[PDB]
Design an enzyme around this catalytic site. Structure first.
Site, short mmCIF file in Angstrom:
data_model
loop_
_atom_site.label_atom_id
_atom_site.label_comp_id
_atom_site.label_asym_id
_atom_site.label_seq_id
_atom_site.Cartn_x
_atom_site.Cartn_y
_atom_site.Cartn_z
N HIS A 43 4.72 2.62 5.63
CA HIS A 43 5.63 1.66 6.37
C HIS A 43 4.99 1.53 7.97
CE1 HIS A 43 6.84 5.74 6.97
NE2 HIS A 43 7.80 5.38 7.95
N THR A 46 1.93 -2.53 9.78
CA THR A 46 0.24 -2.98 9.76
C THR A 46 -0.52 -1.78 9.67
OG1 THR A 46 0.68 -2.91 12.38
CG2 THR A 46 0.78 -4.86 11.29
N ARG A 47 -1.53 -1.97 9.10
CA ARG A 47 -2.70 -1.17 8.66
C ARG A 47 -3.99 -1.85 9.02
NH1 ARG A 47 1.04 1.45 8.35
NH2 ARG A 47 1.70 3.27 7.19
N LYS A 263 1.05 -2.04 19.30
CA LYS A 263 1.46 -0.99 18.56
C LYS A 263 0.29 0.27 18.74
CE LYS A 263 1.54 0.49 13.77
NZ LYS A 263 1.47 0.34 12.45
N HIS A 267 -4.02 9.77 16.36
CA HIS A 267 -4.56 9.94 15.06
C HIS A 267 -4.85 11.46 14.86
CE1 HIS A 267 -6.50 9.25 11.17
NE2 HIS A 267 -7.86 9.54 11.52
N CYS A 313 5.70 8.41 10.14
CA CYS A 313 4.99 8.31 8.99
C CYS A 313 4.39 9.52 8.63
CB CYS A 313 3.94 7.05 9.26
SG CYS A 313 3.17 6.53 7.84
N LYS A 346 -6.43 0.86 3.68
CA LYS A 346 -7.27 -0.29 3.57
C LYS A 346 -8.14 -0.42 2.42
CE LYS A 346 -9.65 1.85 7.10
NZ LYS A 346 -9.02 3.08 7.00
C1 LIG Z 1 1.41 7.35 8.24
C2 LIG Z 1 0.39 6.39 8.84
C3 LIG Z 1 -0.80 6.38 7.80
C4 LIG Z 1 -1.77 5.48 8.03
C5 LIG Z 1 -1.75 4.82 9.42
C6 LIG Z 1 -0.83 5.10 10.40
C7 LIG Z 1 0.34 5.99 10.19
C8 LIG Z 1 1.30 6.01 10.92
N1 LIG Z 1 -2.80 3.90 9.86
C9 LIG Z 1 -3.53 3.59 8.55
C10 LIG Z 1 -4.38 2.32 9.07
O1 LIG Z 1 -4.34 1.47 9.94
N2 LIG Z 1 -5.34 2.09 8.08
C11 LIG Z 1 -5.50 2.77 6.92
O2 LIG Z 1 -6.52 2.47 6.21
N3 LIG Z 1 -4.46 3.73 6.54
C12 LIG Z 1 -3.88 4.08 7.37
N4 LIG Z 1 -2.99 5.17 7.28
C13 LIG Z 1 -2.95 5.84 6.13
C14 LIG Z 1 -2.40 5.14 4.78
O3 LIG Z 1 -1.23 4.61 5.12
C15 LIG Z 1 -2.10 6.24 3.64
O4 LIG Z 1 -3.51 6.79 3.33
C16 LIG Z 1 -1.67 5.58 2.35
O5 LIG Z 1 -0.53 4.84 2.61
C17 LIG Z 1 -1.58 6.89 1.16
O6 LIG Z 1 -1.16 6.02 0.08
P1 LIG Z 1 -0.50 6.84 -1.19
O7 LIG Z 1 -0.24 6.00 -2.39
O8 LIG Z 1 -1.11 8.06 -1.32
O9 LIG Z 1 0.99 7.17 -0.42
P2 LIG Z 1 2.43 6.65 -0.40
O10 LIG Z 1 2.37 4.98 -0.03
O11 LIG Z 1 3.47 7.15 0.45
O12 LIG Z 1 2.88 6.53 -1.80
C18 LIG Z 1 3.37 7.69 -2.59
C19 LIG Z 1 4.88 7.28 -3.50
O13 LIG Z 1 4.89 8.28 -4.18
C20 LIG Z 1 6.39 8.47 -4.33
N5 LIG Z 1 6.74 9.56 -4.88
C21 LIG Z 1 6.62 10.98 -4.27
N6 LIG Z 1 7.17 12.11 -5.03
C22 LIG Z 1 7.29 11.31 -6.21
C23 LIG Z 1 8.23 11.96 -7.31
N7 LIG Z 1 8.35 13.31 -7.64
N8 LIG Z 1 8.59 10.93 -8.30
C24 LIG Z 1 8.14 9.74 -8.23
N9 LIG Z 1 7.56 8.94 -7.05
C25 LIG Z 1 7.25 10.05 -6.36
C26 LIG Z 1 6.89 7.99 -2.99
O14 LIG Z 1 8.29 7.75 -3.11
C27 LIG Z 1 5.74 6.90 -2.38
O15 LIG Z 1 6.54 5.57 -2.88
O1 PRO Z 2 -7.66 4.22 9.07
C1 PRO Z 2 -7.47 3.54 10.07
O2 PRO Z 2 -8.26 2.51 10.37
C2 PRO Z 2 -6.53 3.88 10.99
C3 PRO Z 2 -7.03 4.26 12.44
C4 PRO Z 2 -7.03 5.70 12.51
C5 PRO Z 2 -5.78 5.94 11.70
N1 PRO Z 2 -5.65 4.82 10.56
#
Ligand SMILES: *Cc1cc2c(cc1C)nc1c(=O)[nH]c(=O)nc-1n2C[C@H](O)[C@H](O)[C@H](O)COP(=O)(O)OP(=O)(O)OC[C@H]1O[C@@H](n2cnc3c(N)ncnc32)[C@H](O)[C@@H]1O
Ligand code: PRO
Ligand code: PRO
Ligand SMILES: [Cl-]
EC number: 1.5.3.1
Length: 379
Positions: A43, A46-47, A263, A267, A313, A346
């Protein structure tokens, strides 16, 4: 019974479900919430996607494949997927390994980039004020993904093709046999031939239920949206996305879209947390706002207005900050996607493809050994 169950239908899981459904594989996705949601790692709207990759030149082909898949998704849905803001990377000359590896990555893969120094940066993008000893690499053809829209689009496309999504259902346990997999939830048990496990921050708590012991640390990572000079920081006047190294670490951010405000995130710092007890309120620690304004007042002083919005997040870090994408060492019918270390979104399009290959065939088209679950640096 299904062909494949995906546990965790978030960034990686939903992309995998689309890839499976597209191939007529009977797939169940199970999620604790209803993706996209604000309890995981996807959430905040944006990414960034970069191609020239400071974490390692070896990610570049995955980045480029993922970019092509994002353009394909843009064409298939009515939701907005990608805007080509470009991505600016800068840091003090001679003092940023991240910048240096971005530059090497661009050279090794013949990426299209601009190289700038000092006042050239400030001149090109009004609103930036770096010292004269900083250098930059600007990637014009990378940009910004609308991550919640990506997940929603993949979900709608997968479901149209017969994927089932069971929402608001926590997987509590697993039972793996040579010829089948089973999940246990308070809403019932399900079986399949293959399992994909993609539970984001909860991988750090529940992979023990598959007899895995991998160092994984969830981190609390905040972002803020700030009232900004729209004549400088708007996407409409080509202010870029950015990921930059300063003496006190790495910051990243986004132009204002439609007046939402610039925004910003920090990191390289966050709180070590447990995903079930994290405090999801922005501003409860003084660091949340102060670390952001410390950057803005020095380097982007026209984007340091009132805080319009904050979000909290999670990252899930490995020891080496590289991903885990592999078969379970004891169970070839189980695929693990974990440890995306704050930089996985990404790649989620291309990872979805890899996971689908691993689930269906036990192999992938290209080497993914950098993400091996068996690698020494994981332990
Ligand atoms: C937090 C964050 C991450 C981030 C970022 C900035 C922030 C503040 N900026 C990014 C950026 O600009 N570019 C980029 O490439 N990455 C960036 N990130 C990281 C990225 O968002 C994360 O690496 C990525 O979203 C991880 O994906 P993943 O699929 O691993 O995680 P998720 O989306 O949270 O999905 C996990 C799901 O699992 C469900 N869940 C958890 N436990 C259970 C159980 N027991 N049973 C069923 N489902 C379960 C969760 O509800 C979730 O939906
Ligand atoms: O993976 C990226 O591009 C962004 C910038 C650092 C945190 N996530
Ligand atoms: O805190 C950290 O970043 C590392 C990651 C895995 C375990 N400890
Ligand atoms: Cl992450």
């Amino acid at each position: 019974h299904f062909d494949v169950i995906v546990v965790g239908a978030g960034s990686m899981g939903m992309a995998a479900g689309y890839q499976l459904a597209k191939q007529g594989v009977k797939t169940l996705l199970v999620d604790a919430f209803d993706p996209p949601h604000t309890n995981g790692s996807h959430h905040g709207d944006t990414r960034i996607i970069r191609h020239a990759y400071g974490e390692g030149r070896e990610y570049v082909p995955l980045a480029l494949r993922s970019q092509e898949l994002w353009y394909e998704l843009e064409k298939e849905t009515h939701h907005k997927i990608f805007t080509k803001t470009g991505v600016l990377v800068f840091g003090p000359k001679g003092e940023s390994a991240f910048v240096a590896e971005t530059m090497e990555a661009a050279k090794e893969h013949s990426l299209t980039v601009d190289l700038l120094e000092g006042d050239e940066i400030n001149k090109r993008w009004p609103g930036i004020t770096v010292p004269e000893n900083y250098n930059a690499i600007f990637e014009p053809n990378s940009g910004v993904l609308f991550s919640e829209n990506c997940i929603r689009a993949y979900r709608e496309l997968a479901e149209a093709r017969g994927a089932k999504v069971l929402t608001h259902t926590r997987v509590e346990d697993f039972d793996i046999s040579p010829d089948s997999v089973k999940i246990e939830t308070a809403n019932g048990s399900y079986t399949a031939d293959k399992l994909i496990v993609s539970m984001g921050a909860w991988n750090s708590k529940l992979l023990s239920k598959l007899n895995l012991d991998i160092p994984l640390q969830p981190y609390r990572q905040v972002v803020g949206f700030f009232e900004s000079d729209e004549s400088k920081y708007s996407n409409d006047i080509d202010f870029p996305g950015f990921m930059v190294e300063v003496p006190n670490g790495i910051y990243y951010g986004f132009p204002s879209f439609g007046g939402c405000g610039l925004k910003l995130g920090y990191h390289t710092f966050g709180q070590k947390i447990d995903p079930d007890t994290i405090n999801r309120e922005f501003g409860v620690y003084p660091e949340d706002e102060s670390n952001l304004r410390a950057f803005l007042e020095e380097y982007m002083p026209g984007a340091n207005g009132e805080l319009k919005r904050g979000a909290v997040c999670m990252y899930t870090k490995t020891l080496d900050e590289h991903f885990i994408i592999d078969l379970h060492p004891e169970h070839s019918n189980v695929v693990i996607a974990a440890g995306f270390s704050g930089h996985g979104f990404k790649f989620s399009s291309g990872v979805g493809e890899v996971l689908s290959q691993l689930a269906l065939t036990g192999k992938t088209e290209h080497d993914i050994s950098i993400f091996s679950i068996n690698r020494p640096a994981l332990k």
